[PDB]
Amino acid sequence: QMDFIMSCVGFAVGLGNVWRFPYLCYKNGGGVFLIPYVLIALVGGIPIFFLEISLGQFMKAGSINVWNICPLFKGLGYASMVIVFYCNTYYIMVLAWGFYYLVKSFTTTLPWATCGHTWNTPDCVEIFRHQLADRRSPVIEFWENKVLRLSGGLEVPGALNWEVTLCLLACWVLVYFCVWKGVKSTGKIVYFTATFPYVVLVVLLVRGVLLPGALDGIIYYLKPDWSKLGSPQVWIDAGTQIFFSYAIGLGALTALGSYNRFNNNCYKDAIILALINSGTSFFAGFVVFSILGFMAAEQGVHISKVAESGPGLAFIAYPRAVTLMPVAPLWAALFFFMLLLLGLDSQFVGVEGFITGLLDLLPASYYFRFQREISVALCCALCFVIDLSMVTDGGMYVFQLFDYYSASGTTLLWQAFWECVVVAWVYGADRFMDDIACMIGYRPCPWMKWCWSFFTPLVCMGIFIFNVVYYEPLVYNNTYVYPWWGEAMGWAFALSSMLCVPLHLLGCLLRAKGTMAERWQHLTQPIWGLHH
Ligand SMILES: N=C(N)NCCC(=O)O
Ligand SMILES: [Cl-]
Ligand code: NA
């Protein structure tokens, strides 16, 4: 089938693989991040991936309705919207920044190739020699003083950055327009958009290999520092990175499953999609970390102190690589066009899911002449208004609050744990596996059943508990200690997402009559579709 290609340009391959995984690996240390990544991909990632797709095919519906199997826990679906909504709030910003770089690519030279553009600190040198710890590369200067214009901290937002604001306006109007038409990338264009990224990456990787000091970068990427394994930071980062790269809990995998036919091979679908996501993430890791090793061997700073540890690494490693290509501006335009394509396809599927969920929720009395178009326009405008607080000088910090705490962190752990609990335990993991076998013919290995029943909830609960017990305040670029109210806002996002389940459960219990026993029994009775 081509369902893999359909997801490859959808809720799967994108910035979460090319932009996020590299900087998460860098922030947690190179080698030590892979082991929890692999373990949770085997135990948490692939199993919930297959769970979402299988449940989507089974229920023949997406977003909220799929939880008709356990209507009492239908609030989980609600949470998905909030989570994906938060993605739509900040994901686009990466695109915006990427778009800005693309706008700056179409020049006879490159703005970040050198620093003589009157937006750089005096401590910037284009070439490095044998003062010490007092020099910054032009690429990081451009990233932190033209795209971001980074302020002192979250306490002082500063002056709104107009250039990135027009770039974000262009991204949002483009999303509005080409989501209004609903292109869905057609059927033959997808082919190109599924093979254009890798080509570029491959080229970059080749260049990345042929550099002095790239071997050090690759070794640091692969060989792990076992001391960091005890830290819960790497475990929470790996679990959330997998649950984000797969769009687990965002209510897009479920719709993608619903699009498939009933007599489908969803088990191999999930396995192949997961392998593609992990392979693209590993390839992007190679591309980023070879460049990081090159900059470590060039500047002289340690490999862990080369570039930004926050979300800026993808904008400090990838552009740098481009500057080493023969015809730099053409390759900058090509790579950032690739990045724009990935981010755009992901944003299209996410916004489509959110809008369809909202439209299904709203009653008939709320119908408008252009209800779909007006709803999409209002969502885009509201998200742009929220992002107005993230393009400001002290805007990058807000982005981190929207990245670490919102649609990631303990939010995705909570969502995945409750998904596994409601399906494997409340609904019956054995019965669900029997239903999947009826759908698909054969029987998957019992490893999936063990992952659903015990392994995945246990791993998620353990990561959450060991992070909370040894809680460390979120620090951006290992320099800025977030104040109490910054963590308060981050936890406000997190609890806004994670309250959807318990509040909805409580409201359903109040609405039901009699004692809690028969109320739970009646509200957990599945509501099957017509075809079942
Ligand atoms: N939206 C997500 N949470 N994951 C999608 C991965 C991507 O295409 O970047
Ligand atoms: Cl990934
Ligand atoms: Na991904």
UniProtKB/Swiss-Prot annotation:
Variant or mutagenesis effect after changing residue 129 to H: 82.0% of wild type creatine transporter activity
Q: Which processes are annotated in GO (biological process)?
A: amino acid transport; creatine metabolic process; creatine transmembrane transport; muscle contraction; neurotransmitter transport; nitrogen compound transport; sodium ion transmembrane transport
Membrane topology, as annotated: Multi-pass membrane protein
UniProt keyword Ion transport, yes or no: yes
Q: Check the record and name the InterPro entries matching this protein.
A: Na/ntran_symport (IPR000175), Na/ntran_symport_creatine (IPR002984), SNS_sf (IPR037272)
Leader sequence range is none
GO function terms (MF aspect): creatine transmembrane transporter activity; creatine:sodium symporter activity; gamma-aminobutyric acid:sodium:chloride symporter activity
What does the record say mutating residue 223 to Q does?
Answer: In CCDS1; uncertain significance; no effect on creatine transporter activity
Q: Which UniProt keywords apply?
A: Cell membrane, Disease variant, Glycoprotein, Intellectual disability, Ion transport, Membrane, Phosphoprotein, Sodium, Sodium transport, Symport, Transmembrane, Transmembrane helix, Transport
Q: What is the effect of changing residue 30 to R?
A: In CCDS1; uncertain significance; decreased creatine transporter activity
Q: Which Pfam families match?
A: SNF (PF00209)
Annotated transmembrane regions: 4-24, 31-51, 82-102, 160-180, 199-219, 234-254, 271-291, 324-344, 374-394, 409-429, 450-470, 490-510
Reactions catalysed, as given in the entry? creatine(out) + chloride(out) + 2 Na(+)(out) = creatine(in) + chloride(in) + 2 Na(+)(in)
Mutagenesis / variant outcome for changing residue 247 to T = In CCDS1; uncertain significance; 78.0% of wild type creatine transporter activity
Job of this protein: Creatine:sodium symporter which mediates the uptake of creatine. Plays an important role in supplying creatine to the brain via the blood-brain barrier.
Q: What is this protein called?
A: Sodium- and chloride-dependent creatine transporter 1
Q: Which organism is it from?
A: Homo sapiens
